[PDB]
Structure 1
Amino acid sequence: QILPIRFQEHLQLQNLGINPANIGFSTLTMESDKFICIREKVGEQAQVVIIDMNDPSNPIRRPISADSAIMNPASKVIALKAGKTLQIFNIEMKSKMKAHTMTDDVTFWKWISLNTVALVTDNAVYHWSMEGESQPVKMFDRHSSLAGCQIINYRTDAKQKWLLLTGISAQQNRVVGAMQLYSVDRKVSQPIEGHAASFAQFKMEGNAEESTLFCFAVRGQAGGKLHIIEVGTPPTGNQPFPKKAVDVFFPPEAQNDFPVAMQISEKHDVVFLITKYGYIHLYDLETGTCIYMNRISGETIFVTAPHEATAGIIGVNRKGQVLSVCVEEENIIPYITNVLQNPDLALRMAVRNNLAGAEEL
């Protein structure tokens, strides 16, 4: 009856007059837990609806002529585009801060930091800093293994030295993930089969410096795997982080399911994995040990972000439910000791992340 995670419903977007036809991947963006943006045609007029998560009942509607809108993670600063035309607005100042005209259509973009926008075209990936008069800079050329994929995500490590572009396609009647991992320092791309990924910072006991970890989940022919790998040469003095591989279970009735989102808690050093068809998984970042699995919904959660408050994950499903999952800090250690019968893991996590319940085992 005790669970190692807590669910929370924050919002139903249909209670704010959002039309369910605009609650999907291409029209609703949530770049952080602070804002949701929804593009709606209301009559002849395209609008953006901006939901301040601190003031959810008072959304603002504004006319637009943008094909895409993404809010900055921290600030009421919005990035808008129409084809090759990119504009950045400070909404409170009602002021155009920056503009750039690309020579290619931007097929995917997102904020990768407080101050940087990543742009994906048919053939390349760019970073656009909001500092000063910075224009977009090419990071790498897209690998041929992603040619004709739907681009679904782009992620980087904290220092923006490891870059990961993720595409999906239909091959032999399943959804196949094609990732491109790029080293900024070595100027090499590695194609990887993968569905969802995140980077993370992790300091091993007996290490002075944090390790940079690359975590990805895949449903291959082999089946479900999660990988946790140090990228880059360890900081000098550091022990290397030993690579972990573990299975990702799919039940027999979820033969068509696959991973769609990953967030890592650096407070708890856990990996949250969400599948296309409504399953949640929790893994230990250090060992890859599966802690917990369950169905949220039949419903696809199509966008997620870190949930800063709970060091968890927040998302929106096609119904317009805004839902978060985090570690239940009171239950996780008892749950691992008693339900998982893993006092070893229970005790490690208890002292590593300063949690209660490994006093008695």
Structure 2
Amino acid sequence: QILPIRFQEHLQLQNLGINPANIGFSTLTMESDKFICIREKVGEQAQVVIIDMNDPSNPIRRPISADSAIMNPASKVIALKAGKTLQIFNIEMKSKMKAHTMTDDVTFWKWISLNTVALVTDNAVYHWSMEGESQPVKMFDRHSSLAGCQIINYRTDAKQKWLLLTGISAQQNRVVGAMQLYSVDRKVSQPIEGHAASFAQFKMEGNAEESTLFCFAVRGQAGGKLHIIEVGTPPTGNQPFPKKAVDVFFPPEAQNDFPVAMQISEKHDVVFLITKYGYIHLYDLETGTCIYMNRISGETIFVTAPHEATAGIIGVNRKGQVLSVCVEEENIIPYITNVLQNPDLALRMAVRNNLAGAEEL
């Protein structure tokens, strides 16, 4: 059978001398497909291990006293913290670029762009530009709906006008997602039940300007749902993007499963969704139509990034497998025509994203 996606194993971190005890959410970071950082204690000495994905054979270990390390998405620039102490280093320059002392512990942080670090404290969210003498600026106060959640993600639209904070907690013996969507222009927060989310830019045919889309997936008691919604006033002259809501299927033996990660391909206009217990889903961004579901593994993929090369998703599982999934550009249109029997979707996707196979419907 032809599959509309392709899997690829890039690395086993245990073949690089990474101890499996350090392959987890709190100790391994992958902020982009260019680097993986792992904090390890070897003897008495805390180290950071930096894997250059363009040179994976030669990890470099450096001593640290940081509780958290996140590499810049594009440059060998690393953000380190220990409690309230934040430091930015250019590794190649062996130089401290910037430092700041917070008045609150940072419980979650990540790079939201090439030049900005987002910081989450117990009660607020900050952006920290690496430009000039910029210090962290508060973006919004955390909503009470996320109080006592484990913060697992933070994302923004391209223009940093829509901000989304995601926490989870145990309620009624399931993992319940609490999201806060903040409008920077309107200064309004919306609490939303959700597990995974991304923003995307999408130009509707007949529109001169891109639409800003907010895509989120949730397992409620209502069952699995994926939502694709335009945020903000449509650009002048644009038609509005019509809201989509579709089902997210969980089989009977995965009654405890829930979405953990989402990446949107702007090349293919598809949504990749990964569940906690190793299901992969592919949805059309325009309509929400489910294209494909299958099981990767039992294994939790606990961190993901965009895979630039393939317009796909790359992740690491608890075994230390670095795995990517992308659209199979040669099979997806035949797969949608023949296996899904959806010649409409097939033909739309074939001309929208310039793919082969809708000559033969």
Shorter-chain TM-score tier = over 0.9
Partner residue in 1 for 2:274:
274
- Report whether the alignment pairs 1:128 with 2:147: no
Q: CA deviation at 1:32?
A: 0.1
Q: Deviations over 1:267-310 (max 9, x none)?
A: 00000000000000000000000000000000000000000000
Partner residue in 2 for 1:60:
60
Q: CA deviation at 1:336?
A: 0.0
Q: Deviations over 1:112-165 (max 9, x none)?
A: 000000000000000000000000000000000000000000000000000000
Q: CA deviation at 1:314?
A: 0.1
Q: Deviations over 1:199-234 (max 9, x none)?
A: 000000000000000000000010000000000000
Q: How does 1:17-36 map to 2 (within 5 A)?
A: 17-36=17-36
Partner residue in 2 for 1:352:
352
Partner residue in 2 for 1:89:
89
Q: CA deviation at 1:321?
A: 0.1
The two structures, once aligned, show a CA RMSD in angstroms of 0.2
Mapped to 2, the partners of 1:197 and 1:26 lie a distance apart of 20
Mapped to 1, the partners of 2:177 and 2:286 lie a distance apart of 25
Mapped to 2, the partners of 1:292 and 1:333 lie a distance apart of 12
SS of equivalent residue, structure 1 residue 10: strand
Mapped to 1, the partners of 2:196 and 2:260 lie a distance apart of 6
Q: CA deviation at 1:251?
A: 0.2
Partner residue in 2 for 1:203:
203
Mapped to 1, the partners of 2:204 and 2:221 lie a distance apart of 33
Q: CA deviation at 1:168?
A: 0.1
Partner residue in 2 for 1:284:
284
- Report whether the alignment pairs 1:333 with 2:347: no
Mapped to 1, the partners of 2:295 and 2:57 lie a distance apart of 29
SS of equivalent residue, structure 1 residue 350: helix
Q: CA deviation at 1:26?
A: 0.2
Q: Percent identity?
A: 100
Q: Deviations over 1:159-201 (max 9, x none)?
A: 0000000000000000000000000000000000000000000
Q: Structure 1: where are the runs of 5+ without partners? A: none
Q: CA deviation at 1:347?
A: 0.1
Partner residue in 2 for 1:258:
258
Mapped to 1, the partners of 2:252 and 2:17 lie a distance apart of 38
- Report whether the alignment pairs 1:184 with 2:158: no
SS of equivalent residue, structure 1 residue 246: strand
Q: Structure 2: where are the runs of 5+ without partners? A: none
SS of equivalent residue, structure 2 residue 208: coil
TM (norm. structure 2) is 1.00
Q: CA deviation at 1:28?
A: 0.1
SS of equivalent residue, structure 1 residue 74: coil
SS of equivalent residue, structure 2 residue 354: coil
Q: CA deviation at 1:330?
A: 0.1
Q: Deviations over 1:5-30 (max 9, x none)?
A: 00000000000000000000000000
Q: Deviations over 1:213-258 (max 9, x none)?
A: 0000000010000000000000000000000000000000000000
Mapped to 2, the partners of 1:290 and 1:360 lie a distance apart of 22
Mapped to 1, the partners of 2:164 and 2:360 lie a distance apart of 42
TM (norm. structure 1) is 1.00
SS of equivalent residue, structure 1 residue 200: strand
Partner residue in 1 for 2:298:
298
Mapped to 1, the partners of 2:302 and 2:94 lie a distance apart of 30
Q: CA deviation at 1:337?
A: 0.1
Mapped to 1, the partners of 2:16 and 2:198 lie a distance apart of 32
Mapped to 2, the partners of 1:312 and 1:247 lie a distance apart of 22
SS of equivalent residue, structure 2 residue 199: strand
SS of equivalent residue, structure 2 residue 237: coil
Q: Deviations over 1:305-339 (max 9, x none)?
A: 00000000000000000000000000000000000
Mapped to 2, the partners of 1:22 and 1:327 lie a distance apart of 31
Mapped to 2, the partners of 1:100 and 1:5 lie a distance apart of 44
Mapped to 1, the partners of 2:279 and 2:199 lie a distance apart of 21
Q: Deviations over 1:28-68 (max 9, x none)?
A: 00000000000000000000000000000000000000000
SS of equivalent residue, structure 1 residue 346: helix
SS of equivalent residue, structure 2 residue 316: strand
SS of equivalent residue, structure 1 residue 348: helix
| Count of aligned pairs | 361
Partner residue in 1 for 2:218:
218
SS of equivalent residue, structure 1 residue 351: helix
Mapped to 1, the partners of 2:104 and 2:187 lie a distance apart of 22
Q: Deviations over 1:59-92 (max 9, x none)?
A: 0000000000000000000000000000000000
Mapped to 1, the partners of 2:16 and 2:312 lie a distance apart of 25
